[PDB]
PDB file of all heavy atoms in Angstrom:
ATOM      1  N   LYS D  18      -8.405 -60.015 -19.186  1.00 58.66           N
ATOM      2  CA  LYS D  18      -9.034 -60.751 -20.276  1.00 58.66           C
ATOM      3  C   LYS D  18     -10.098 -59.887 -20.950  1.00 58.66           C
ATOM      4  O   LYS D  18     -11.299 -60.072 -20.788  1.00 58.66           O
ATOM      5  CB  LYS D  18      -9.618 -62.058 -19.759  1.00 58.66           C
ATOM      6  CG  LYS D  18      -8.565 -63.091 -19.405  1.00 58.66           C
ATOM      7  CD  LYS D  18      -9.183 -64.406 -18.972  1.00 58.66           C
ATOM      8  CE  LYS D  18      -9.902 -64.283 -17.637  1.00 58.66           C
ATOM      9  NZ  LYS D  18      -8.978 -63.960 -16.519  1.00 58.66           N
ATOM     10  N   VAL D  19      -9.614 -58.928 -21.735  1.00 58.58           N
ATOM     11  CA  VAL D  19     -10.457 -58.075 -22.557  1.00 58.58           C
ATOM     12  C   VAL D  19      -9.857 -58.030 -23.955  1.00 58.58           C
ATOM     13  O   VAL D  19      -8.672 -58.296 -24.157  1.00 58.58           O
ATOM     14  CB  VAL D  19     -10.597 -56.653 -21.975  1.00 58.58           C
ATOM     15  CG1 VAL D  19     -11.089 -56.713 -20.547  1.00 58.58           C
ATOM     16  CG2 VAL D  19      -9.279 -55.915 -22.048  1.00 58.58           C
ATOM     17  N   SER D  20     -10.695 -57.696 -24.929  1.00 58.21           N
ATOM     18  CA  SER D  20     -10.270 -57.700 -26.318  1.00 58.21           C
ATOM     19  C   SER D  20      -9.387 -56.493 -26.619  1.00 58.21           C
ATOM     20  O   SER D  20      -9.290 -55.545 -25.839  1.00 58.21           O
ATOM     21  CB  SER D  20     -11.478 -57.711 -27.244  1.00 58.21           C
ATOM     22  OG  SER D  20     -12.145 -58.953 -27.175  1.00 58.21           O
ATOM     23  N   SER D  21      -8.735 -56.538 -27.779  1.00 61.34           N
ATOM     24  CA  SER D  21      -7.837 -55.455 -28.155  1.00 61.34           C
ATOM     25  C   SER D  21      -8.591 -54.158 -28.404  1.00 61.34           C
ATOM     26  O   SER D  21      -8.050 -53.075 -28.165  1.00 61.34           O
ATOM     27  CB  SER D  21      -7.030 -55.850 -29.388  1.00 61.34           C
ATOM     28  OG  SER D  21      -7.860 -55.989 -30.524  1.00 61.34           O
ATOM     29  N   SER D  22      -9.830 -54.237 -28.888  1.00 59.36           N
ATOM     30  CA  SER D  22     -10.613 -53.022 -29.064  1.00 59.36           C
ATOM     31  C   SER D  22     -10.907 -52.362 -27.726  1.00 59.36           C
ATOM     32  O   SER D  22     -11.031 -51.138 -27.651  1.00 59.36           O
ATOM     33  CB  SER D  22     -11.913 -53.334 -29.796  1.00 59.36           C
ATOM     34  OG  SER D  22     -12.631 -54.347 -29.124  1.00 59.36           O
ATOM     35  N   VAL D  23     -11.031 -53.161 -26.667  1.00 59.49           N
ATOM     36  CA  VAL D  23     -11.175 -52.611 -25.325  1.00 59.49           C
ATOM     37  C   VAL D  23      -9.889 -51.922 -24.897  1.00 59.49           C
ATOM     38  O   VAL D  23      -9.907 -50.807 -24.367  1.00 59.49           O
ATOM     39  CB  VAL D  23     -11.568 -53.723 -24.339  1.00 59.49           C
ATOM     40  CG1 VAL D  23     -11.686 -53.173 -22.933  1.00 59.49           C
ATOM     41  CG2 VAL D  23     -12.865 -54.381 -24.768  1.00 59.49           C
ATOM     42  N   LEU D  24      -8.750 -52.583 -25.112  1.00 58.41           N
ATOM     43  CA  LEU D  24      -7.469 -51.977 -24.776  1.00 58.41           C
ATOM     44  C   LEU D  24      -7.220 -50.730 -25.609  1.00 58.41           C
ATOM     45  O   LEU D  24      -6.741 -49.716 -25.095  1.00 58.41           O
ATOM     46  CB  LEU D  24      -6.342 -52.981 -24.987  1.00 58.41           C
ATOM     47  CG  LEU D  24      -6.400 -54.289 -24.206  1.00 58.41           C
ATOM     48  CD1 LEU D  24      -5.344 -55.227 -24.733  1.00 58.41           C
ATOM     49  CD2 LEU D  24      -6.208 -54.058 -22.731  1.00 58.41           C
ATOM     50  N   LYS D  25      -7.532 -50.789 -26.904  1.00 57.17           N
ATOM     51  CA  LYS D  25      -7.308 -49.635 -27.767  1.00 57.17           C
ATOM     52  C   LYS D  25      -8.177 -48.460 -27.350  1.00 57.17           C
ATOM     53  O   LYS D  25      -7.732 -47.310 -27.383  1.00 57.17           O
ATOM     54  CB  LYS D  25      -7.577 -50.006 -29.222  1.00 57.17           C
ATOM     55  CG  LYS D  25      -7.469 -48.833 -30.171  1.00 57.17           C
ATOM     56  CD  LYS D  25      -7.040 -49.264 -31.552  1.00 57.17           C
ATOM     57  CE  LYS D  25      -6.758 -48.065 -32.427  1.00 57.17           C
ATOM     58  NZ  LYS D  25      -6.364 -48.463 -33.791  1.00 57.17           N
ATOM     59  N   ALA D  26      -9.423 -48.728 -26.958  1.00 58.57           N
ATOM     60  CA  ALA D  26     -10.313 -47.649 -26.547  1.00 58.57           C
ATOM     61  C   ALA D  26      -9.778 -46.923 -25.322  1.00 58.57           C
ATOM     62  O   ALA D  26      -9.868 -45.695 -25.234  1.00 58.57           O
ATOM     63  CB  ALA D  26     -11.708 -48.199 -26.272  1.00 58.57           C
ATOM     64  N   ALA D  27      -9.212 -47.660 -24.371  1.00 56.55           N
ATOM     65  CA  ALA D  27      -8.720 -47.091 -23.125  1.00 56.55           C
ATOM     66  C   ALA D  27      -7.221 -46.822 -23.138  1.00 56.55           C
ATOM     67  O   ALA D  27      -6.662 -46.476 -22.096  1.00 56.55           O
ATOM     68  CB  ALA D  27      -9.059 -48.019 -21.962  1.00 56.55           C
ATOM     69  N   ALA D  28      -6.558 -46.974 -24.283  1.00 53.91           N
ATOM     70  CA  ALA D  28      -5.100 -46.902 -24.306  1.00 53.91           C
ATOM     71  C   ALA D  28      -4.603 -45.541 -23.844  1.00 53.91           C
ATOM     72  O   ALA D  28      -3.663 -45.451 -23.049  1.00 53.91           O
ATOM     73  CB  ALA D  28      -4.583 -47.206 -25.709  1.00 53.91           C
ATOM     74  N   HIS D  29      -5.217 -44.466 -24.332  1.00 54.86           N
ATOM     75  CA  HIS D  29      -4.689 -43.139 -24.043  1.00 54.86           C
ATOM     76  C   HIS D  29      -4.810 -42.803 -22.563  1.00 54.86           C
ATOM     77  O   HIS D  29      -3.863 -42.294 -21.956  1.00 54.86           O
ATOM     78  CB  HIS D  29      -5.400 -42.095 -24.901  1.00 54.86           C
ATOM     79  CG  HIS D  29      -4.745 -41.874 -26.225  1.00 54.86           C
ATOM     80  ND1 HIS D  29      -4.988 -42.676 -27.318  1.00 54.86           N
ATOM     81  CD2 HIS D  29      -3.835 -40.958 -26.626  1.00 54.86           C
ATOM     82  CE1 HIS D  29      -4.268 -42.253 -28.340  1.00 54.86           C
ATOM     83  NE2 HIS D  29      -3.560 -41.211 -27.947  1.00 54.86           N
ATOM     84  N   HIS D  30      -5.969 -43.075 -21.961  1.00 56.32           N
ATOM     85  CA  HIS D  30      -6.106 -42.873 -20.524  1.00 56.32           C
ATOM     86  C   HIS D  30      -5.271 -43.884 -19.752  1.00 56.32           C
ATOM     87  O   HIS D  30      -4.661 -43.547 -18.734  1.00 56.32           O
ATOM     88  CB  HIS D  30      -7.574 -42.967 -20.112  1.00 56.32           C
ATOM     89  CG  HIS D  30      -8.391 -41.781 -20.516  1.00 56.32           C
ATOM     90  ND1 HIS D  30      -8.143 -40.511 -20.048  1.00 56.32           N
ATOM     91  CD2 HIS D  30      -9.453 -41.673 -21.348  1.00 56.32           C
ATOM     92  CE1 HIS D  30      -9.013 -39.672 -20.575  1.00 56.32           C
ATOM     93  NE2 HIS D  30      -9.820 -40.351 -21.368  1.00 56.32           N
ATOM     94  N   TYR D  31      -5.228 -45.127 -20.224  1.00 52.34           N
ATOM     95  CA  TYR D  31      -4.425 -46.143 -19.555  1.00 52.34           C
ATOM     96  C   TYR D  31      -2.954 -45.757 -19.540  1.00 52.34           C
ATOM     97  O   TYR D  31      -2.246 -46.022 -18.563  1.00 52.34           O
ATOM     98  CB  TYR D  31      -4.617 -47.488 -20.247  1.00 52.34           C
ATOM     99  CG  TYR D  31      -3.640 -48.549 -19.818  1.00 52.34           C
ATOM    100  CD1 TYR D  31      -3.777 -49.198 -18.607  1.00 52.34           C
ATOM    101  CD2 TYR D  31      -2.583 -48.910 -20.634  1.00 52.34           C
ATOM    102  CE1 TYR D  31      -2.890 -50.169 -18.221  1.00 52.34           C
ATOM    103  CE2 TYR D  31      -1.690 -49.879 -20.254  1.00 52.34           C
ATOM    104  CZ  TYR D  31      -1.847 -50.505 -19.049  1.00 52.34           C
ATOM    105  OH  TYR D  31      -0.953 -51.473 -18.671  1.00 52.34           O
ATOM    106  N   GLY D  32      -2.475 -45.132 -20.612  1.00 49.30           N
ATOM    107  CA  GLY D  32      -1.087 -44.708 -20.645  1.00 49.30           C
ATOM    108  C   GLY D  32      -0.765 -43.675 -19.584  1.00 49.30           C
ATOM    109  O   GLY D  32       0.316 -43.696 -18.994  1.00 49.30           O
TER     110      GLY D  32
END
Side-chain angles (χ1 to χ4, degrees):
Chain D
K18 288 183 292 296
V19 305
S20 290
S21 66
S22 55
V23 179
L24 301 170
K25 176 151 188 181
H29 271 84
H30 287 298
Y31 169 76

